[PDB]
């Protein structure tokens, strides 16, 4: 909350900050090893929620910048969605419900940068037509002893359409299924098992399942070049039936949805995306000392496949 | 110049911080404490005029923001005053001549804050109606090894009409007379013999000049008590006619305008008031290691009423 409260002024001051710079087309090298630091310290100036001691730090501005606009994100729309109202717990929404903003170690920020070039590169070589995370900034908050990381994504869901069920699927063939205890809650992340034992089906048009399983294709290899796995398909369903009780949706905002076929049972529009790349391989595996890259990658793009059938 | 991005930069974050704080119609004690620090560290984000590593300080943001509303002054008014465009030296202006910048030590700093709780009780006593400097604003200014003060004034003379004639009195015993090389420059600062021995005089009207006098008497008396003197009357003469080669003038802007009596031998407008009041007595006496607090009060306020007779 004064955490969240130093975020809302950080990114105000980061995007009017960079209203100035003049932007280039191309970003060099140096680009990518920036930061921008701002420590405030209010002696007897108390503000309403404001701390009088922190410290606020972007890291690669000018990468993100880029990235933004690339994502067809003005600055202005950016900055207005994550300040005019404080950002909601859920990770966090921002109160227009398109961004999302996770808290990140400094393990995942170490590995943000180790990836930023080639995922940048990655970016460009597709025009910004990927399933995977849109990574729009990131940050580092410090208020009076408390340090965080965050980094905000582009929401995988829709900002108006609502979705009934969630799934999380990794495709491993290890048991992965939702617990008793997790199925209880009101918006289950049920998973590979839920799905496959309870007959999911997903009825998009078969053009739109060529294209979305190409994208996912080539994703996710770049994805196991790097080295990373553990990462899932997240899938929204919004009924338009349940919602009413008229399920057209901006492709341009709503970037992830897919209409279903015309012979759909019900009227549905899917979410579907990629999540949680971070987890570098050697990461995993010192977590569970508290499934290779590859693996991660055939089992991955095999199940989806299966789901979709 | 970099120094004047930061200052430029600082008013314009101190102003907007303050847009959002409910301001009483009180200060309390510690507000005449208070401070804002920020320092920007920026690595491999070199902006335009920007210096990539500064510090600004702003003293005393409560006291000084209901200072310059007790002025008459709104702050985004004065912040497009201050940023819009940048001083120009001269001291320095802002740029559009409404308000002085000067460079000031440590000391005189020192000396502000210790007055600053008697000055502000005297602006409330007299509504903000006096000859004293209006001061705006206190900040301390970094840039990589470079620290200096500046406080921000009301500027004495119009920001419409030019000033062709100026002279800086004491009242001084003391020998006081402009330098054959100062009288050299194109707007002198001629001093107590210029004026006396060149026959100036100040054509305004009886009534105007029994209100000023009083005012002088008052705030000569008022600086008297804080053991202050080395201060000066400052006039300014407007000469209508060279200027057109009309005459009015927004006495609320131009607040220390007086108009000349309507048997003027010339159309001319008057700015006086008085200027450089922080030389505290033992200040003077250190500087003069490299003349009573009273006794400047009497010879200054008996020769102000020579000068109008």
């Given at each position: 909350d004064p955490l969240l409260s130093v975020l809302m002024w950080g990114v105000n001051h980061s995007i009017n900050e960079l209203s100035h710079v003049q932007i280039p087309?191309?970003?060099?090298?140096?680009?990518?090893?920036?930061?921008?630091?701002?420590?405030?310290?209010?002696?007897?100036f108390n503000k309403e929620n404001?701390?009088?001691?922190?410290?606020?730090?972007?890291?690669?501005?000018?990468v993100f910048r880029n990235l933004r606009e690339r994502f067809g994100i003005d600055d202005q729309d950016f900055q207005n969605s994550l300040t005019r109202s404080a950002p909601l717990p859920n990770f966090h929404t921002s109160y227009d419900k398109r961004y999302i903003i996770k808290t990140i170690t400094s393990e995942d920020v170490a590995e943000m940068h180790n990836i930023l070039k080639k995922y940048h590169?990655?970016?460009?070589?597709?025009?910004?037509?990927t399933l995977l995370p849109q990574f729009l900034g990131m940050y580092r908050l410090n208020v009076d002893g408390v340090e965080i990381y965050v980094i905000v994504?582009?929401?995988?869901?829709?900002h108006?359409?609502?979705?009934?069920?969630?799934?999380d699927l990794k495709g491993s063939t290890v048991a992965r299924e939702a617990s008793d205890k997790e199925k209880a809650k009101e918006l289950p992340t049920l998973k590979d098992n839920d799905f496959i034992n309870e007959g999911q089906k997903i009825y998009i048009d078969d053009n739109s399942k060529k294209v979305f399983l190409e994208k996912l294709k080539?994703?996710?290899?770049?994805?196991?070049?790097?080295?990373?796995?553990?990462?899932?398909?997240?899938?929204?369903?919004?009924?338009?039936?349940?919602?009413?009780?008229?399920?057209?949706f901006d492709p341009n905002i709503d970037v992830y949805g897919i209409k279903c076929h015309e012979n759909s049972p019900r009227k549905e529009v899917y979410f579907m995306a990629i999540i949680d790349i971070l987890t570098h391989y050697d990461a995993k595996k010192k977590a569970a000392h508290a499934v290779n890259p590859e693996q991660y990658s055939k089992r991955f793009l095999d199940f989806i496949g299966h789901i979709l059938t």
């Open positions: 087309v191309m970003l060099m090298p140096d680009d990518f090893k920036a930061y921008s630091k701002i420590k405030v310290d209010n002696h007897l404001m701390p009088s001691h922190f410290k606020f730090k972007e890291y690669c501005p000018m590169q990655y970016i460009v070589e597709c025009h910004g037509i994504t582009r929401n995988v869901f829709s108006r359409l609502s979705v009934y069920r969630k799934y080539k994703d996710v290899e770049f994805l196991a070049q790097l080295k990373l796995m553990d990462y899932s398909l997240l899938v929204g369903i919004h009924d338009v039936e349940r919602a009413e009780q008229p399920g057209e």
